[PDB]
């Protein structure tokens, strides 16, 4: 009966990890940051509105220059916007219209998209002779593609619904490393600022910190009660925020190995679809299912503003690398640039 | 501004092409096909003629789009909102699988999936076209085996007409919103025709209900 012995050992071992977690909990984030002055009410005006999509918008990603952004929609079109003049630089027709993610290469010569076809496709924007054409179709996943992020011009990390992430090589199209350990579908991921680690949110209410090089999970985080819909890294790199389906946000710290503060209100019962941080990390913008975006004071866990300008569910969020704007997409086929 | 004015007319040339594709896509009928794997969905597809399977067929100058999600094997809730907006949902259930087990028999597995897909919060007004395939294999099996293995509360003769009508009644009983959506039930033979016609008739009623919504009558 080694199965029962192993199960008992895991429960005892998990108790030891839990015992060490509360031992280091000397204080709380709210208690420490109670003396700080609030950021005050924040009002963001719609500085721009981008039209041209004819279906629900599922994902967008800001360019590294903080001027271009790529938006993915379910009508089969990938559109690159000039966020300063609303100009459409490119319009990429996709083979499959069921796309749930889009990524922008840090160099800017590539974009990626994927979805229910279980294939991540890389498109060449440089196009030395002609227009934008596909470059590689990274097949090998078993479930739907839920997120994808570029590490460089030749490496991309993709998380799918088959409970396993992966690290690809664009030149050969082979899975360099496969990450396993999740018990549910992986719905999002966020690369570290130093591009050495990343965190993945799954449907089992757990976020796991991976290592790109070694390929083994380093830490696990619990505290959510429903599916984690979106994850994002703190700009420092020693924390991250998760958005689950129980209408709550949590800020986990990579060194304390435990949740620090929670961002919940009694008025909101709708789950969070997207989260993002400001340039300094003081503001935690979260997109909800109740047709508007919210701004949270990450250091005091107090509501500080509402970006109510959408007539449908907000499905994606983005903050420029410069930090001077916020673009929020939604299912009403509209993108809006705020402040 | 000389180069900027040329960049604006490029965006406008992109805009006019986006509308042209959107007009073409709006004139197409999108359907969703579901089943229990070996329920005859492949058999149904032939009559109307990894990842997602897309099928294209036309009938009476109407272009249909069929999507098969039988190879996903993932959490249905996380990607079911993508199909919210299809004209109709096609459900395939094999009547011959009332005694085969996957435990629990395969028929109750079909009923469990039908209960969730019909009562989904995203599908509250989409018509469901229910297909009961394998009627030839079901009519011979009832002679040698009863229906009591499937439904223990069954009380009737072991004849095709009575047994077939009882299974249809059990599947329609799972419809909780009896006043908002209509469930179309058809009995599909292994080698038969007019099944694409049954989809055309059911889809037309959806378009009429859609057209009246623009005019405000319905």
């Amino acid at each position: 009966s080694e199965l029962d012995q192993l199960r008992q050992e895991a429960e005892q071992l998990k108790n030891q990890i839990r015992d060490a977690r509360k031992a280091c909990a000397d204080a709380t984030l709210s208690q420490i940051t109670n003396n700080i002055d609030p950021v005050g009410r924040i009002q963001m005006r719609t500085r721009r509105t981008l039209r041209g999509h004819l279906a629900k918008i599922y994902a967008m990603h800001w360019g590294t220059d903080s001027r271009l952004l790529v938006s993915a929609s379910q009508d089969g079109k990938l559109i690159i916007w000039d966020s300063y003049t609303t100009n459409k630089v490119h319009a990429i027709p996709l083979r499959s219209s069921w796309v749930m993610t889009c990524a922008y290469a840090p160099s800017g010569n590539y974009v990626a998209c994927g979805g229910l076809d279980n294939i991540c496709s890389i498109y060449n924007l440089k196009t030395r002779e002609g227009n934008v054409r596909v470059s590689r179709e990274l097949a090998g996943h078993t479930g739907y593609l839920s997120c994808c992020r570029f590490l460089d011009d030749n490496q991309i990390v993709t998380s799918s619904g088959d409970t396993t992430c992966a690290l690809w090589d664009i030149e050969t199209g082979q899975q360099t490393t496969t990450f396993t350990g999740h018990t549910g579908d992986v719905m999002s991921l966020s690369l570290a600022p130093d591009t050495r680690l990343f965190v993945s949110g799954a449907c089992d209410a757990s976020a796991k910190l991976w290592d790109v090089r070694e390929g083994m999970c380093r830490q696990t985080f619990t505290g959510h009660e429903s599916d984690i819909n979106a994850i994002c890294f703190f700009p420092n790199g020693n924390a991250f925020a998760t958005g689950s389906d129980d209408a709550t946000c949590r800020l986990f710290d990579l060194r304390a190995d435990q949740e620090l503060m929670t961002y919940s209100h009694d008025n909101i019962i709708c789950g969070i679809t997207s989260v993002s941080f400001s340039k300094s990390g003081r503001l935690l913008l979260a997109g909800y299912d109740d047709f508007n975006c919210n701004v949270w004071d990450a250091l005091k866990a107090d509501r500080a503003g509402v970006l109510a300008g959408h007539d449908n569910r907000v499905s994606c969020l983005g903050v420029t690398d410069d930090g001077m704007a916020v673009a929020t997409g939604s299912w009403d086929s509209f993108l809006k640039i705020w402040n | 501004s000389a180069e900027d004015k040329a960049a604006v007319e490029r965006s406008k040339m992109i805009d006019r092409n986006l509308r042209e594709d959107g007009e073409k896509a709006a004139r197409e009928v999108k359907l969703l096909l579901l089943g229990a794997g070996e329920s005859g969905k492949s058999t149904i597809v032939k009559q109307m003629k990894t990842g997602i399977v897309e099928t294209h067929f036309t009938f009476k100058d109407l272009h249909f789009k069929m999507f098969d999600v039988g190879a996903q094997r993932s959490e249905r809730k996380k990607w079911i909102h993508c199909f919210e907006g299809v004209a109709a949902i096609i459900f395939c259930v094999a009547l011959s699988d009332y005694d085969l087990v996957l435990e629990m028999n395969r028929m109750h597995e079909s009923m469990k999936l039908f209960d969730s897909i019909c009562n989904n919060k995203w599908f509250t007004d989409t018509s469901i076209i229910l297909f009961l395939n394998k009627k030839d294999l079901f009519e011979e099996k009832i002679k040698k085996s009863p229906l009591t293995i499937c439904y223990q509360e069954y009380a009737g003769s072991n004849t095709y007409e009575e047994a077939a009508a009882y299974i249809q009644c059990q599947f329609e009983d799972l419809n909780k919103r009896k006043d908002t959506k209509e469930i179309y039930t058809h009995f599909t033979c292994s080698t038969d025709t007019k099944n694409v016609q049954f989809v055309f008739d059911a889809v037309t009623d959806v378009i009429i209900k859609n057209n009246l919504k623009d005019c405000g009558l319905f």
Partner: single-chain antibody, 226 residues
Framework: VESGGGLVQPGGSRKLSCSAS????????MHWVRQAPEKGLEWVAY????????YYADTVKGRFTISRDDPKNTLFLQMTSLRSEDTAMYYC??????????????WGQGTTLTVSSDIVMTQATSSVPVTPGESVSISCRSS???????????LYWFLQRPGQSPQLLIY???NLASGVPDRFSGSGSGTAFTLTISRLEAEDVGVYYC?????????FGAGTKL
């Protein structure tokens, strides 16, 4: 690649044709820059993508006409009244305009034919010592400042190797064209612009032209032969 053109006629008419090949001709705006036997380049006409806005040089406004045929990927130029002032080699230049594009990137082979206000770019320098291995700077000047309110100075640097078509080195103030070695550099102040070359190779000889793109009646700088 692209090629095609007309031949010699006495004081009559001729139709110039270009044959685009494998670069998605339907989404490129095309020019018809021409160069006389011994002078610098001179812009002639332009037709945008989708046959929209069309511009003509002041000297060929009434006599010339430019049109494109997107199927079969062919560009046309029809000249009705032809004088002795317009004997030249007619080049075909492609150019696409979006946020980060590089116009005038590829120049056609060009064909010759014999018949038997605006912005002025000076480029006062006309001859430079040709010794290898030196760091040479080529200067330019403009009548009015090219620094648009957008923040980018529209100035393009072209190199014409002896016997071949012009090739784009620098587009706008400092951006380096694709395939150009990083030795070339470009800096300007809105009115005075310089092109810097670190180490001259045996293939760096030729005539260097500067072109503005602020107002569409655009002019070149007559070149500075090395």
């Amino acid at each position: 690649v692209e090629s095609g053109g007309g031949l010699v006629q006495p004081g009559g008419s001729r139709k110039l044709s270009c044959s685009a090949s494998g670069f998605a001709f339907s989404s490129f705006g095309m020019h018809w820059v021409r160069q006389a036997p011994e002078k610098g380049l001179e812009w002639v006409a332009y037709i945008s993508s989708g046959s929209g806005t069309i511009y003509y040089a002041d000297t060929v406004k009434g006599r010339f006409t430019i049109s494109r045929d997107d199927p079969k990927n062919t560009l046309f130029l029809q000249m009705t009244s032809l004088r002795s002032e317009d004997t030249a080699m007619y080049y075909c230049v492609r150019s696409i305009y979006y946020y980060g594009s590089s116009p005038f990137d590829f120049w056609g082979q060009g064909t010759t034919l014999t018949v038997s206000s605006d912005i002025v770019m000076t480029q006062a320098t006309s001859s430079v010592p040709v010794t290898p291995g030196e760091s040479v700077s080529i200067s330019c000047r403009s009548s009015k400042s090219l620094l648009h309110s957008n923040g980018n100075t529209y100035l393009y640097w072209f190199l014409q190797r002896p016997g071949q078509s012009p090739q784009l080195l620098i587009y706008r103030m400092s951006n380096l064209a694709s395939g150009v070695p990083d030795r070339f550099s470009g800096s300007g102040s809105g009115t005075a612009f310089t092109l810097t070359i670190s180490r001259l190779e045996a293939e760096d000889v030729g005539v260097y032209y500067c072109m503005q793109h602020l107002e569409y009646p655009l002019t070149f700088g007559a070149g500075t032969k090395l």
